[PDB]
């Protein structure tokens, strides 16, 4: 179980164990039945050092899960600024669309993460991006009560 | 201290979210559902076995850190 142990170690922050698998030849791009790669669970759990190790070894920064969610999506939903920046500096697509048009900017605007929205805009997030429901991130921000976040989105015109 | 981390699982997909404790749960309900392309109302969400209303807030449910929200397909 070289792969299945890698994903389990990536979550809950078993940095030593992740290092052990990857030094023993484990596939850093392994997938589970949900399409999640070890980078996905490392980012979604707020584990910065493990994310850096996986990226330095050669993990797919733009890996898509079963519904097109990238590690950037899972980092944005928890509002982890460092991991977002690390992924963006390592080639993560800032405007990556999932299977239904949801971008990391969309998720950041809906969940109410001002810093994540600002950083994504700084790295080139598309304000005019429309999901399968025809909603721009400004629409989500003004929908979910995130008005101050919708201020920055409107400023980017 | 002001925000909360919550895990949403349907037995198949488990995802962590971080939201304000003073904001409605709706965002968390929608982003999880719309990832699969489903509407929020096409999914029942349970905290301690009790349906979560969209307008409810984490502080209304006495939610703690690393809490778990169960998701089940409706109909």
Swiss-Prot record, chain B:
Additional information: Present with 2940 molecules/cell in log phase SD medium.
Function field: Not known; suppressor of MIF2 mutations.
Complexes and interactors: Activated by a E1 ligase composed of AOS1 and UBA2.
Biological process terms in GO annotation: protein sumoylation
Full protein: residues contained: 21 to 95 of 101
Ubiquitin-like domain sequence ranges: 2-75
Origin: domain of life: Eukaryota
GO cellular component: condensed nuclear chromosome; nucleus; septin ring
Record's protein name: Ubiquitin-like protein SMT3
Ranges in coiled-coil conformation: none
Taxon lineage: Eukaryota, Fungi, Dikarya, Ascomycota, Saccharomycotina
Gene Ontology molecular functions: identical protein binding; protein tag activity; ubiquitin-like protein ligase binding
Family: Belongs to the ubiquitin family. SUMO subfamily.
Keyword Acetylation among UniProt keywords: yes
Keywords: Acetylation, Isopeptide bond, Phosphoprotein, Ubl conjugation pathway
